[PDB]
């Protein structure tokens, strides 16, 4: 290949292999905070009501009655507990993917 | 005159007289501080060395040797006393014009 | 039976049908991305 | 005999002939204007 002209010849094989692998490697997952701490960077949803409000704002959805009425209707009762319970299960599920 | 059209007729004579006088009156002299105090305005030469320095600056005259040497040469001796003496006489002279 | 049905029922009155569906898809997106960007610190925060 | 002659003598060495004459006329102007704008407060300041 053209780039092989400049680099020492014995470097070419490995690089080629890397290239063939690099087009196949699944992208980098989220970085652990441990690794992020080394980086100089520091620019790496609260409750279902706040989540839905953020969703409406991102979608620009106008509430019909009101957002305050929406928040007051639920008030995090037992029936809605499921949501956070779901969260637990979801995160519990993730514990299987990275044991 | 045209301006006489608007003003009441009996005003015209006096004004005319004033006009004929106004073109003749010598301009207003400097105003006394007493009168200036009433005005809301407050934007109404120290020694011969400072006077000459101000004169040179206004005329943009470059000193040949130096201004400090000029100041040191005199140092306000008896011979130069005349200047301030002259001032006195000058101001004394003014005392005759406004007795 | 699920948070999705409760949210749909509430939005049926607090938002229009099109707005409710858009908000639902928007939140599904946010949830999916939060799952894609989950880390140990996030798990610790959930525990707290 | 007069401040003018003393100033001319000093400027003959501290300034050029043209510069000396310009400074002299400039100061004569300043003096004349100061006389034209003399007031009682100015007299009081002189007394001080």
């Amino acid at each position: 290949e053209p780039w092989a002209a400049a680099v020492p010849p014995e470097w070419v094989p490995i690089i080629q292999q890397d290239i063939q692998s690099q087009r196949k490697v699944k992208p980098q997952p989220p970085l652990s905070d441990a690794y992020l701490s080394g980086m100089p960077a520091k620019r790496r949803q609260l409750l279902l009501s706040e989540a839905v409000s953020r969703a409406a704002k991102a979608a620009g959805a106008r509430p019909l009655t009101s957002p305050e009425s929406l928040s007051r209707d639920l008030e995090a009762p037992e029936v809605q507990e499921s949501y956070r319970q779901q969260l637990r299960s979801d995160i519990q599920k993730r514990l299987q993917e990275d044991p | 005159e045209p301006w006489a059209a608007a003003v009441p007729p009996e005003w015209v004579p006096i004004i005319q007289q004033d006009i004929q006088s106004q073109r003749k009156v010598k301009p207003q002299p400097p105003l006394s501080d007493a009168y200036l105090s009433g005005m809301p305005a407050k934007r109404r030469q120290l020694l011969l060395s400072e006077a000459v320095s101000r004169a040179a600056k206004a005329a943009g005259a470059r000193p040949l040797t130096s201004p400090e040497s000029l100041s040191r040469d005199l140092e306000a001796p008896e011979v130069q006393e005349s200047y301030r003496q002259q001032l006195r006489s000058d101001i004394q002279k003014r005392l005759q014009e406004d007795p | 039976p699920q948070v999705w049905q409760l949210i749909s029922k509430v939005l049926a009155r607090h938002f229009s049908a099109a707005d409710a569906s858009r908000v639902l898809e928007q939140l599904q997106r946010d949830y999916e991305r939060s799952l894609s960007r989950l880390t140990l610190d996030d798990i610790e925060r959930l525990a707290s | 005999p007069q401040v003018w002659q003393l100033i001319s003598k000093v400027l003959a060495r501290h300034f050029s002939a043209a510069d000396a004459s310009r400074v002299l006329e400039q100061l004569q102007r300043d003096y004349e204007r100061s006389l034209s704008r003399l007031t009682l407060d100015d007299i009081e300041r002189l007394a001080s």
Partner: protein
């Protein structure tokens, strides 16, 4: 028992005043003032502070009396006491007893004027301005007295003091100038009647001014015609008078901008 402390404090203040401990009495006066105000006894506190200020003035305790007068002003402000002639007279008397060179007079005048008709004008009832100006005139503080006259509503005293001021500190060539300025300033404050009366009185009383509406001085004739036009309200007359008398009006440059206000105020000239 709760009310006993204030009574005992008042008795102690009386004893201290008798003993001549003037500073301690001043502090006790401050404490009594604050206690009374906390009880909403605004009138009693004001009377006490006025009496104490007068007493301290009598004994030469200038700073203490000034502080108590400031407390009187504070009481008037806090209680929103409606402006009254008697209160203005009291404030003027208190200001008179002060020392002219002290800034306390400046602060007291500013605060009193602000309290007096604080809604608009910074005038109160000009009666206060008139009283302060008269006190300054008796003190021969012509500048401040003239300013207060300008903000007052008494033109006769203003004309008399202008005559005196021009005669004493004025010049031969400024005799008319003075009154003209004053008149313009009066008109710059919408007080046309004050301008008319002051001009009349100054012309009538000043020895150097020959009595009669047709004055020899062009400026006086201009001022009289301007007053008449302002009464009429015709802009063309104002423009004609300004143009024809330009040489005399140029004697004092401010006149020009003064005129710029007059046409705006009495002839509808846009700004």
């Amino acid at each position: 028992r709760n009310r006993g402390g204030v009574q005992r404090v008042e008795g102690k203040l009386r004893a201290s005043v008798e003993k001549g401990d003037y500073y301690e009495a001043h502090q006790m006066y401050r404490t009594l003032f604050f206690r009374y105000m906390s009880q909403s006894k605004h009138t009693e506190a004001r009377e006490l502070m006025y009496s104490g200020a007068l007493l301290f003035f009598s004994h030469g305790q200038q700073n203490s009396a000034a502080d108590l007068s400031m407390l009187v002003l504070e009481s008037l402000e806090k209680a929103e006491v409606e402006v009254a002639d008697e209160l203005l007279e009291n404030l003027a008397k208190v200001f008179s007893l002060m020392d002219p060179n002290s800034p306390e007079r400046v602060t007291f005048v500013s605060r009193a004027l602000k309290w007096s008709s604080g809604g608009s004008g910074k005038l109160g009832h000009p009666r206060l301005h008139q009283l302060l100006a008269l006190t300054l005139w008796k003190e021969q503080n012509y500048c401040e007295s003239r300013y207060h006259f300008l903000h007052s509503a008494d033109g006769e005293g203003c004309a008399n003091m202008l005559v005196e001021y021009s005669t004493s500190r004025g010049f031969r060539s400024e005799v008319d100038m003075f009154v003209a300025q004053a008149v313009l300033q009066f008109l710059c404050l919408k007080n046309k009647s004050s301008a008319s009366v002051v001009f009349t009185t100054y012309t009538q009383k000043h020895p150097s001014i020959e009595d009669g509406p047709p004055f020899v001085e062009p400026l006086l004739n201009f001022i009289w015609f301007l007053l008449l036009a302002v009464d009429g309200g015709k802009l063309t007359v104002f423009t004609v008078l300004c143009e024809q008398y330009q040489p005399s009006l140029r004697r004092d440059p401010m006149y020009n901008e003064y005129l710029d206000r007059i046409g705006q105020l009495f002839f509808g000239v846009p700004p």
